[PDB]
């Protein structure tokens, strides 16, 4: 029985458009779905998508043999600077298919062995920091928890220190990806993007791009330089040969490999941690369960790469805050052919679908009625439940690349944090979610008092 599909408030001419002019547009997206439920249509002049919030229908848009990755024009902007890399190529373009033969046995649980050295390196450099406040100090979660990422995947990357604990300035080379991150999203609700008032915007773009390039090519150069075997995933990157094509990437590929690394491995996981130390310090008890872990299992001055794995309740305190501040908290999906979705909306070859994830997360017709409640325990039991409920790491063979390498980042600092330090919400923190490409707590603060346990 074919259906006709809820649509939110129009503005004459504008339709649905005006409706993303505002700071925080995923979360205005949210409160829409509450309204109309499942699915909506969303129309600007030129353009429509529609919204799934159901596991009842994103398990049909989950469905790789009807759907694929839409590059949403948040991605076009993004491919400016982010090029055929991973994150910003349509699945049909030769480099997706290279990079990603190439690159999946680089980013296996297999191959965090090798990395867990180097996320150690800077994992200490934080609780060194932290251990070093004095009495009367506080922490910048989301800053704090921003160095520690950023630093381990440019060490663990690319064998680049961006020495983040050493400076209140970014490096220059994030301070133009950050500008340049910036002002992708800002035109997403520009009117008007070639009206003269928008030259300087469009010159500083092109400076900060120049910046990206001009440190990324040098670092490639370096490497093909030196001859340096590094066993780091621009070695990896050099080396390596696609098995279907036969052929390696070529140099400019790998720089836009390298800065979508850099832009995943910033604040889309920096803000996990910051979102997991939130719940934690907001939920005195499971934050005592999970030190009670961290206790029992990391038994020497140095977590072991066997010892993370073994932090099974601190895995589920990072699943359940992806479950409810999902960091990438969308993706965009197009018809391969016709189709019906759910029995009851006809699809269009081409026609475009968002999946709006943190409203998936909510579904009560797959977590109960307690689907606001930060409760751990219920992914104690994975095998219950149903397919595609959970995708904060996406769907499919365009996947997150990274999502082994972000969880045991993660499970490690968060398991050290909860080691070395009792926390405090000083100020009781009123939750803010700034929205940029990423999620995140913005003013989040908390006081760590040393349990004076040595590194
Ligand atoms: C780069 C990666 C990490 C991101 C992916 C995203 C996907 C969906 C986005 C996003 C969350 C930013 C806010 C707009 C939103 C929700 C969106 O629906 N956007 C649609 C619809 C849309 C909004 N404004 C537009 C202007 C023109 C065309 C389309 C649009 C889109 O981008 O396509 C955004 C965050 C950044």
Same mark, same amino acid.
């Given at each position: ?8 408030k ?6 649905n458009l ?7 547009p995923?979360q ?6 509450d ?14 998508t ?17 759907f ?6 948040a ?8 090029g055929?890399?991973?994150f ?11 990079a990603?033969?190439?690159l ?11 990395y ?17 406040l004095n ?7 989301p ?6 990422? !950023? ?8 064998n680049?220190?961006?020495?983040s604990?050493?400076?209140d300035?970014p ?12 002002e ?5 609700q ?6 003269p ?13 120049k ?7 040098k ?9 340096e ?8 990157? !050099? ?8 052929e390696?990437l070529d140099d400019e ?11 995943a491995?910033?604040?889309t ?13 907001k ?12 206790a029992?299992?990391?038994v ?5 790469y ?19 501040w ?5 993706f965009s999906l ?7 979705l759910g &029995?009851?909306?006809?699809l ?27 409760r ?5 039991n ?5 397919? +595609?409920?959970?995708?904060?790491? &996406?769907?499919g ?9 972000a969880?045991?980042?993660?499970t490690?600092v ?5 080691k +070395? ?13 700034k929205?940029?490409?990423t ?17």
């Amino acid at each position: 029985t074919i259906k006709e599909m809820p649509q939110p408030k129009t503005f004459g001419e504008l339709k649905n458009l005006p409706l993303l002019n505002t700071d925080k547009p995923v979360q205005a997206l949210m409160k829409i779905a509450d309204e109309l439920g499942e699915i909506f249509k969303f129309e600007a002049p030129g353009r429509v998508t529609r919204y799934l919030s159901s596991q009842r229908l994103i398990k049909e848009a989950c469905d790789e043999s009807r759907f694929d990755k839409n590059l949403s024009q948040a991605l076009k902007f993004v491919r400016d600077f982010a090029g055929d890399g991973l994150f910003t190529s349509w699945t049909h373009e030769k480099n997706w298919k290279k990079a990603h033969n190439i690159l999946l046995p680089s980013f296996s649980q297999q191959a965090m062995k090798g990395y867990h050295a180097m996320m150690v390196d800077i994992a200490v450099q934080l609780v060194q920091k932290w251990e070093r406040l004095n009495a009367d100090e506080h922490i910048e979660v989301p800053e704090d928890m921003t160095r520690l990422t !950023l630093d381990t995947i440019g060490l663990c990357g690319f064998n680049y220190r961006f020495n983040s604990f050493y400076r209140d300035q970014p490096h220059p080379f994030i301070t133009s990806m950050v500008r340049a991150l910036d002002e992708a999203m800002n035109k997403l609700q520009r009117a008007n993007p070639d009206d003269p008032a928008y030259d300087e915007n469009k010159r500083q773009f092109q400076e900060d791009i120049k910046v990206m390039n001009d440190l990324v090519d040098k670092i490639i150069a370096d490497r093909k330089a030196s001859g340096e075997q590094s066993d780091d995933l621009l070695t990896h990157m !050099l080396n390596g040969k696609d098995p279907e094509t036969g052929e390696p990437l070529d140099d400019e590929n790998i720089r836009y490999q390298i800065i979508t690394f850099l832009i995943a491995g910033h604040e889309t996981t920096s803000g996990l941690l910051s979102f997991a130390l939130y719940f934690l310090v907001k939920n005195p008890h499971v934050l005592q369960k999970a030190a009670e872990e961290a206790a029992r299992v990391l038994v020497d001055p140095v977590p072991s790469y066997k010892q993370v794995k073994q932090l099974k309740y601190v895995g589920m305190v990072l699943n359940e805050a992806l479950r409810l501040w999902p960091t990438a908290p969308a993706f965009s999906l197009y018809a391969k052919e016709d189709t019906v979705l759910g &029995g009851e909306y006809p699809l269009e070859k081409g026609d475009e679908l968002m999946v709006l994830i943190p409203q998936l997360h909510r579904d009560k017709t797959i977590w109960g009625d307690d689907v606001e409640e930060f409760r751990p325990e219920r992914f104690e039991n994975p095998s219950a439940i149903p397919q +595609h409920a959970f995708k904060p790491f &996406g769907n499919g063979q365009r996947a997150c690349i990274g999502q082994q390498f972000a969880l045991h980042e993660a499970t490690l600092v968060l398991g050290m944090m909860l080691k +070395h330090f009792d926390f405090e919400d000083h100020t009781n923190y009123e939750l803010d979610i700034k929205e940029t490409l990423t999620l995140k707590p913005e003013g989040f603060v908390v006081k760590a008092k040393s349990k004076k346990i040595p590194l």
